[PDB]
Amino acid sequence: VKPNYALKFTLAGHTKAVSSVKFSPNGEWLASSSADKLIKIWGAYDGKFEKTISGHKLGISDVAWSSDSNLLVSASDDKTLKIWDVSSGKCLKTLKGHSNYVFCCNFNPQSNLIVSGSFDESVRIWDVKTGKCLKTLPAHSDPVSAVHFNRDGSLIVSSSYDGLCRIWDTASGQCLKTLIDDDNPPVSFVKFSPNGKYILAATLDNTLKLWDYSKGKCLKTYTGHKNEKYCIFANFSVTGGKWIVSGSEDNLVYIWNLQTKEIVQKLQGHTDVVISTACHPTENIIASAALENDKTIKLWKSDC
Numbered sequence: 550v551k552p553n554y555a556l557k558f559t560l561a562g563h564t565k566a567v568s569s570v571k572f573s574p575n576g577e578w579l580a581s582s583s584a585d586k587l588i589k590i591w592g593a594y595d596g597k598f599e600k601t602i603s604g605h606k607l608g609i610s611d612v613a614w615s616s617d618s619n620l621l622v623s624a625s626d627d628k629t630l631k632i633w634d635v636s637s638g639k640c641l642k643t644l645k646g647h648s649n650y651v652f653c654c655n656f657n658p659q660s661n662l663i664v665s666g667s668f669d670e671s672v673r674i675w676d677v678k679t680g681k682c683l684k685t686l687p688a689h690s691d692p693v694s695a696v697h698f699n700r701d702g703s704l705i706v707s708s709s710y711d712g713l714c715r716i717w718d719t720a721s722g723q724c725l726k727t728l729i730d731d732d733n734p735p736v737s738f739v740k741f742s743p744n745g746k747y748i749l750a751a752t753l754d755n756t757l758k759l760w761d762y763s764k765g766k767c768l769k770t771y772t773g774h775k776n777e778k779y780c781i782f783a784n785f786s787v788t789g790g791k792w793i794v795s796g797s798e799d800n801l802v803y804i805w806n807l808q809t810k811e812i813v814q815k816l817q818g819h820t821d822v823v824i825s826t827a828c829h830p831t832e833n834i835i836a837s838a839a840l841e842n843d844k845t846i847k848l849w850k851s852d853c
């Protein structure tokens with residue numbers, strides 16, 4: 550039954566809205582990005598501040614870790630992505646090609662590719678080793694809110710303000726599936742399940758949906774939260790009970806039972822929109838992050 554997430558740490562340091570928080574795949578770290586143009590690294594278990602990584606000329610929407618936890622990629626309003634050495638804090642590559650703000654980014658599981666989505670309505674696939682753009686997908690007809698690889702990196706899912714989710718063949722760059730639902734509200738977030746079998750999508754009508762994307766069938770929805778404006782990150786939590794975790798525009802983190810769709814916990818504490826949540830890879834730990842009235846990251850721990 551219910552999780553019992555309690556507040557363990559509040560991480561202050563960013564001087565503007567925080568955009569994204571991500572745990573390293575090794576479970577060691579949390580990375581955060583912010584409108585303040587900075588990436589900060591924190592200890593996942595002790596909340597200790599480790600380092601600040603700088604170099605972007607404008608605010609940063611997203612950050613993501615390579616599979617060996619040695620590299621970070623960030624997506625910035627400055628129209629670039631940057632690849633960072635976590636150890637030195639140094640910018641290794643600047644990925645240039647997008648014609649407007651880059652909103653979202655991920656490594657493939659192999660961590661030889663980066664996928665990016667932009668205000669410029671494209672999705673780009675980049676070679677990690679060289680930093681070169683390998684493919685530009687004419688992905689959507691409005692800003693791209695999220696990009697994610699499946700478990701083997703053979704597929705990419707993207708979401709957009711155009712009301713669509715798309716599934717892409719990574720190797721060829723061909724669209725394999727376009728999802729539509731209801732009256733096509735903006736799709737503000739999407740990701741694959743840990744196994745790759747499903748996609749979880751948020752739309753700006755206060756709804757998360759779980760999809761069997763190949764069958765084109767919605768299996769569950771998660772509602773009760775507030776999501777009408779911001780591109781709020783959501784997650785599968787699989788270390789204990791099977792939960793859906795999301796931020797919300799009423800300053801709370803919402804946790805649902807994945808199967809029953811019931812709200813099982815609401816986490817109070819933040820003082821602005823919780824735009825990002827992350828789930829720890831091995832421990833029942835949530836990181837959550839909030840917008841400019843708050844600017845803090847919170848770490849929470851549960852027994853299941």
Ligand SMILES: Cc1cccc(C(=O)Nc2cc(-c3ccc4[nH]ccc4c3)ccc2N2CCN(C)CC2)c1
Pocket residue numbers: 566567568569570583584585608609610611612652653692693694695710779780781782824825
């Ligand atoms: C630097 C910074 C700090 C705090 C918040 C944001 C932000 O809200 N991000 C953003 C904006 C838009 C965005 C901005 C302006 C727009 N006009 C029309 C559509 C549209 C979308 C789309 C996606 C995203 N994100 C959210 C965070 N996530 C981890 C990745 C994606 C950025």
